[PDB]
Amino acid sequence: MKIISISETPNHNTMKITLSESREGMTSDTYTKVDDSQPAFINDILKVEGVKSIFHVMDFISVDKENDANWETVLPKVEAVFELEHHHHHH
């Protein structure tokens, strides 16, 4: 559940993220304006300049950006999402 493998596609505006899950399918929704019961960590991605929108479905996620932007710029931010310490802050 933290980027396991990417996939090549004719275009380069949006790539699919492979999850550690398979078959069945986890969540499935489109995020174009934040708020949708998604992980706050993903809110960053949407709020991260360069990103256009996100589409969650089956056991993968399609992240689209702006042709004007790049990946090497957005990636560093995306990695932070599934990499920032996992705990249940409660004290």
Task: Spell out the domains of the chain, with CATH numbers in brackets.
Answer: 1-91 (3.30.1370.70)
Structure tokens that stand for 10 in this block: 């004719």
DSSP letters spanning the chain: ----B----S-SSEEEEEPS--SS----EEESSS-SS--HHHHHHHHSTTEEEEEEETTEEEEEE-TTS-HHHHHHHHHHHT-S-------
State how far the Cα of 55 lies from the Cα of 19, in Å rounded to an integer: 14
| Method underlying the structure | NMR
State how far the Cα of 55 lies from the Cα of 90, in Å rounded to an integer: 31
The residue count of the chain comes to 91
State how far the Cα of 59 lies from the Cα of 68, in Å rounded to an integer: 28
Query: Which sign does the torsion angle of CA 9, 12, 14, 17 carry?
Result: positive
Contact predicate 71/46, CB 8 Å: no
Contact predicate 56/31, CB 8 Å: yes
State how far the Cα of 53 lies from the Cα of 46, in Å rounded to an integer: 6
